[PDB]
Design an enzyme around this catalytic site. Structure first.
Site, mmCIF file in Angstrom:
data_model
loop_
_atom_site.group_PDB
_atom_site.id
_atom_site.type_symbol
_atom_site.label_atom_id
_atom_site.label_comp_id
_atom_site.label_asym_id
_atom_site.label_seq_id
_atom_site.Cartn_x
_atom_site.Cartn_y
_atom_site.Cartn_z
ATOM 1 N N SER D 101 -0.100 3.616 -0.462
ATOM 2 C CA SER D 101 -0.698 2.942 0.711
ATOM 3 C C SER D 101 -0.653 2.690 2.389
ATOM 4 O O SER D 101 0.222 2.648 2.903
ATOM 5 C CB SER D 101 0.091 1.069 -0.273
ATOM 6 O OG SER D 101 1.673 1.378 0.725
ATOM 7 N N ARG D 102 -2.100 2.469 3.019
ATOM 8 C CA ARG D 102 -1.971 3.344 4.077
ATOM 9 C C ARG D 102 -1.490 1.362 5.237
ATOM 10 O O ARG D 102 -2.778 1.768 6.488
ATOM 11 C CB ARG D 102 -3.637 3.188 4.318
ATOM 12 C CG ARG D 102 -3.959 4.534 3.045
ATOM 13 C CD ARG D 102 -4.761 6.127 3.975
ATOM 14 N NE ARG D 102 -5.911 4.845 3.583
ATOM 15 C CZ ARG D 102 -6.244 5.256 2.565
ATOM 16 N NH1 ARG D 102 -6.808 6.377 1.671
ATOM 17 N NH2 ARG D 102 -8.135 4.964 2.513
ATOM 18 N N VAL D 103 -1.118 0.115 4.643
ATOM 19 C CA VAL D 103 -1.003 -0.515 5.154
ATOM 20 C C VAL D 103 0.388 -0.830 5.186
ATOM 21 O O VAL D 103 1.090 -2.028 5.027
ATOM 22 C CB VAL D 103 -1.458 -1.593 5.189
ATOM 23 C CG1 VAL D 103 -2.146 -3.210 5.890
ATOM 24 C CG2 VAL D 103 -3.181 -1.953 4.406
#
Ligand SMILES: Nc1ncnc2c1ncn2[C@@H]1O[C@H](COP(=O)(O)OP(=O)(O)OP(=O)(O)O)[C@@H](O)[C@H]1O
Ligand SMILES: [Mg+2]
Lengths: 476, 470, 117, 119
Positions: D101-103
């Site tokens: 996940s890039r958050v």
């Protein structure tokens, strides 16, 4: 009018202009004298499939229609001949002189026209007759790779079907003509030709004859079935027929599916195999037994055509490649070979004795793997392994020499009871034939009793005769 | 008649002639053209009809480059399939697919016999019951994997392990002891073999009879397809007209399917299988079925075939392999041992005589040979792991005899006379079986193993051992 | 679901599935490394997994024609009780084949008696 | 995946040219049009948010197929679920290694970040 002009020719397909009244499925004969099947109608041009050689055809030829659906002539006159798929003689000896004709698109016997199988079919092979019995009307699939002895099994069956009333029709599709001639000569030598018909189409022939062959064979069998005669049909290979229909379909521009075959493969194979059935007493009791062949590359069952055919067959016979190469003749695997209708056709005595043998063979098969792992073993396992070895020895048939059932039950009972423990493994083979001869010359009454009663005779005198042969036999 | 060109589509050509009276399928059309002006180019081309189309159009395939073809040019039809020149006059030279010799030693006269390539296979009436075994004069072949005459033979041997020597010896024997001539037709790589065959078979003189036909990779698809059928028509002339007891050879079958790989490119139609032409089985069958025995004449077209593909499950190798009758294998590891020919106990079929007819002794000897070889293989496995010295006496004797049996397999080929200096030996099959039987029976257990090399008969082994001054 | 089938049934089902998955990977491990390199608890896991997969076979009614055995109808409670008993390893002594094609665990005991155990 | 199948069927009936797996040329256009509306509007606009959790079905876990590749290149992260861990006794069967996940650092409370890093 009934005459039209061809406007295209290529690789067995031709279109024609005219032919207003032509019916779908009709037979049309060209001015050359060759005839074709009108598969497709169109608004202006009928599509014709050419059965014979197409090289002579030209644009501008006039094609005529016979006026009938695809028909194969049939009759008792054909017995003892060799014919094309279409009913034209390919062996000299003058014309056929058939009685009547039967279309190839007959409707199969529906539900309530059939009955459960109750009559056995004796192939004469100890392994097939004993462990995997087959009954008249049961369609048994024979799967194996090349060089595994399948045609040996089929010819042994046809040869053994001598005393029993069995019109046996043999069809080879695409096979090499030299093998066909060798098989015809082999049948003539053993005197099995007077009650058999051979119809074949070779690889050189156009595809339409190759895909028409097996239907013509089963249509030949249908005439004899209707009068009440029992019939046996053997297909040399179904896979090559599938390839021929793949050729014909894709040359007609029909999209393929899984692998490369079109979607009609299941329809094609199932329609052919469904016509073989055991008719009920009300219909007349006729029976048609089919023994189709399919080729499995590298002995893998998981494939489109093999599983497709397995879904139709009432059983399977799996011939092991490496077992055949080792020297065991014929080759069959206990684990994978099963007959659904088996046990309802096999005679009482065989069920009385032979039933114990199959479990012993399979258990020996797996214990063989464990013993191959195991250097050191206990005595009971050693006895089981020795019994398995003896059973494997007894199950080896001689080529082109089918054995009558009564000898089979006698030898198998002699094995199962365990008298053979003293006899060495190699001596067992000679023991079998010497025992056969001793029973034949001296022990007639047991053979007659088994022939008539279908049941095991009095055990005490039977064992006495077996012991007398054990007295006469000399160990090596 | 005369018809004009209308379309060109490169390799598939697809020349749509507009004509008055069409030629049948497979017929030959020849185009002659001259450079009328600077732009136009003179071309002489032959084409084979393959398909009829609407109206007068007839699709064709060209056997050479079509560069320079112009719409409107006139075309003449011969009247029959492309006519190979065949007969006595044509023996002893190398041809292209069409029929002209590639080597310019001489030109075939117009008067010669010319026959069409495409002919239906022999009818079922003329075939013969096949039980007999052809004699090769090679001990291992006559002992382990005999060849049924009239049947296709397979030899899976890499290049440089003795393929050329083996085929030279086979053709030399078949022309020396039998009345058979050979025919060769290659498709692959370079023909350095031409000079080897020139040496040995021109010393023998068989080169004057073998009519080689060559068209290789550089050729268009059509010629690469029809080369094998030209080669077969060469044999067909002998079998039909000559009717001699010439059990001739033709030395390529699978190469037709290797060309069929390019015939898939020649089609230009709906694909099937793995990109292959739909008619793969039919197209190969048409060729394979013309090789038969017959009662018209004592001509068996038995053929020895090499399969470069060597992949089991592929549709084309499988389809070809279904037609094969006997199989043989050449391996380099056996070539290392100095045992020539380098053939291993692998075999196929060949039971028409033994044990079918009588063949008891031959069949039992062969079975014992294979059993002993496999036992020696497992014993050799054991020897490396632990050591031979610990083996029991009865088990050691098996290796003792196995060494002699392994070494006896070598044969002093006649063709090797120009390198080795050995005159060469020819052995009858019955003599091979009878002599070898004593080896299994241990008649000569005491003789040294080195005597059992490159000799024809067992008495030669004994005399060689004597010559070693025992 | 635990509410639909009951707690004990759900727990037995999930423990059986876990053990069968562990064996499903152990077979690959055995193929690559051998059957001798496994740990003691791994030996126990394989030991019980074999018996569990064997006991799932049942003698059928319609198979009386095909093979000639009577056939049995097994209640659910008998199934869960037998599976719990084998999962707890109360039948360590019995051979593997005694668990083959039987209806009830009492038939397993009878088959082992017939074996001469 | 059923949306892709429905669009493939309705395109093929229309005689539009096929593509990699008989899918028409507009598949990525359609899925990007759908998924691009999900956003987090600025404070000025009002501060609303439209988060999405699309599901994708895959045969035998071949997540390298055409549609999974398209969706994984359109999304901001994936949760990879495998029946292997499911029957292994670890539920819900989430593959931590393959899930990204890039958050990751911004969408957590500070104590969750502090502990979850070491975890
Ligand atoms: N039971 C057997 N005992 C001895 N020899 C056998 C036996 N079965 C086959 N053979 C030999 O092996 C050959 C194999 O021929 P066969 O036609 O049976 O081969 P296949 O590849 O199994 O079948 P098919 O040609 O029908 O596909 C026979 O011609 C025969 O010489
Ligand atoms: Mg055969």
């Amino acid at each position: 009018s009934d005459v039209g002009t061809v406007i295209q020719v290529g690789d067995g397909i031709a279109r024609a202009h005219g032919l207003d009244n032509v019916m779908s499925g009709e037979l049309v004969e060209f001015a050359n004298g060759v005839m074709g099947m009108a598969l497709n109608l169109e608004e202006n041009n009928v599509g014709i499939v050419i059965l014979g050689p197409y090289t002579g055809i030209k644009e501008g030829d006039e094609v005529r229609r016979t006026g009938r659906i695809m028909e194969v002539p049939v009759g008792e006159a054909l017995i003892g001949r060799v014919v094309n798929p279409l009913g034209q003689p390919v062996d000299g000896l003058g014309p056929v002189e058939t009685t009547e004709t039967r279309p190839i698109e007959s409707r199969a016997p529906g539900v309530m026209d059939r009955r459960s199988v109750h009559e056995p079919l004796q192939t004469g092979i100890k392994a097939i007759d004993a462990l995997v019995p087959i009954g008249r009307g049961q369609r048994e699939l024979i799967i194996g790779d090349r060089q595994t002895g399948k045609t040996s099994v089929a010819i042994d069956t046809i040869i053994n079907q001598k005393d029993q009333n069995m019109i046996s029709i043999y069809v080879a599709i695409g096979q090499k003509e030299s093998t066909v001639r060798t098989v015809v000569e082999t049948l003539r030598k053993h005197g099995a030709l007077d009650y058999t018909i051979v119809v074949t189409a070779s690889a050189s022939q156009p595809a339409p004859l190759l895909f028409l062959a097996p239907y013509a064979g089963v249509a030949m069998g249908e005439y004899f079935m209707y009068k009440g005669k029992h019939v046996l049909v053997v297909y040399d290979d179904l896979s090559k027929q599938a390839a021929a229909y793949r050729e014909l379909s894709l040359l007609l521009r029909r999209p393929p599916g899984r692998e490369a075959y079109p979607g009609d493969i299941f329809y094609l194979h199932s329609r052919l195999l469904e016509r073989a059935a055991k008719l009920s007493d009300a219909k007349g009791g006729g029976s048609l037994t089919a023994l189709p062949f399919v080729e499995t590359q590298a002995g893998d069952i998981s494939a489109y055509i093999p599983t497709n055919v397995i879904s139709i067959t009432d059983g399977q016979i799996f011939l092991q490649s490496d077992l055949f190469f080792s020297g065991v003749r014929p080759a069959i695997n206990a684990g994978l070979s099963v007959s659904r209708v088996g046990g309802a056709a096999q005679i009482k005595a065989m069920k009385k004795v032979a039933g114990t043998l199959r479990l012993d063979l399979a258990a020996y098969r797996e214990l063989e793997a464990f013993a191959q792992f195991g250097s050191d073993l206990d005595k009971a396992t050693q006895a089981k392994l020795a019994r398995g070895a003896r059973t494997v020895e007894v199950l080896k048939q001689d080529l082109h020499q089918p054995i009558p059932v009564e000898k089979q039950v006698l030898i198998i009972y002699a094995l199962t009871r365990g008298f053979l423990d003293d006899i060495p493994v190699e001596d067992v083979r000679r023991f079998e034939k010497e025992f056969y001869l001793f029973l034949d010359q001296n022990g007639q009454h047991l053979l007659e009793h088994i022939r008539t009663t279908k049941d095991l005779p009095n055990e005490d005198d039977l064992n006495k005769a077996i012991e007398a042969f054990k007295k006469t036999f000399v160990v090596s | 008649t005369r018809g004009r060109v209308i379309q060109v589509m490169g390799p598939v050509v697809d020349v749509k002639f507009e004509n008055g009276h069409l030629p049948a399928i497979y017929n030959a059309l020849k185009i002659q053209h001259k450079a009328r002006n600077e732009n136009e180019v003179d071309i002489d081309l032959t084409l084979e009809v393959a398909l009829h189309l609407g109206d007068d159009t007839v699709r064709t395939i060209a056997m050479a480059s079509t560069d320079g073809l112009i719409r409107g040019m006139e075309v003449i039809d011969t009247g029959a399939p492309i006519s190979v020149p065949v007969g006595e006059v044509t023996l002893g030279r190398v041809f292209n697919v069409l029929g002209e010799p590639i080597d310019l030693e001489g030109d075939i006269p117009a008067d010669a016999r010319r026959d069409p390539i495409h002919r239906p296979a022999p009818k079922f009436e003329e075939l013969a019951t096949e039980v007999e075994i052809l004699e090769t004069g090679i001990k291992v072949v006559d002992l382990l994997a005999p060849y049924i005459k009239g049947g296709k033979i397979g030899l899976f041997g890499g290049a440089g392990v003795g393929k050329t020597v083996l085929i030279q010896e086979l053709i030399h024997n078949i022309a020396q002891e039998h009345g058979g001539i050979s025919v060769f037709a290659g498709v692959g790589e370079r023909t350095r073999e031409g000079n080897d065959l020139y040496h040995e078979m021109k010393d023998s003189g068989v080169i004057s009879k073998t009519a080689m036909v060559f068209g290789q990779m550089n050729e268009p698809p059509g010629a690469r397809m029809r080369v094998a059928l030209t080669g077969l028509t060469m044999a067909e002339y002998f079998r039909d007209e000559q009717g001699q007891d010439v059990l001739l050879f033709i030395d390529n079958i699978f190469r037709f399917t290797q060309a069929g790989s390019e015939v898939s490119a020649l089609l230009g139609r709906m694909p099937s299988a793995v990109g292959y032409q739909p008619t793969l089985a039919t197209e190969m069958g048409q060729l394979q079925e013309r090789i038969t025995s017959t009662a018209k004449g004592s001509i068996t077209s038995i053929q020895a075939i090499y399969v470069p593909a060597d992949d089991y499950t592929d549709p084309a190798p499988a389809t070809t392999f279904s037609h094969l009758d006997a199989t043989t294998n050449l391996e380099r590891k056996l070539a290392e041992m100095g045992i020539y020919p380098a053939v291993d106990p692998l075999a196929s079929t060949s039971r028409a005589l033994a044990p079918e007819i009588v063949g008891e002794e031959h069949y039992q000897v062969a079975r014992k040979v294979q059993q002993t070889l496999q036992r020696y293989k497992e014993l050799q496995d054991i020897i490396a792991i632990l050591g031979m010295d610990e083996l029991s006496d009865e088990d050691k004797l098996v290796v003792h005899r196995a060494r002699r049996i392994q070494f006896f397999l070598s044969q002093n080929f006649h063709v090797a006379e120009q390198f080795t200096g050995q005159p060469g030996s020819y052995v009858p099959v019955k003599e091979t079986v009878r002599g070898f039987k004593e080896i299994l029976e241990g008649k000569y257990d005491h003789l040294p193993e080195d005597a059992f090399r490159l000799v024809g008969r067992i008495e030669e082994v004994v005399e060689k051992a004597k010559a070693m001054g025992v």
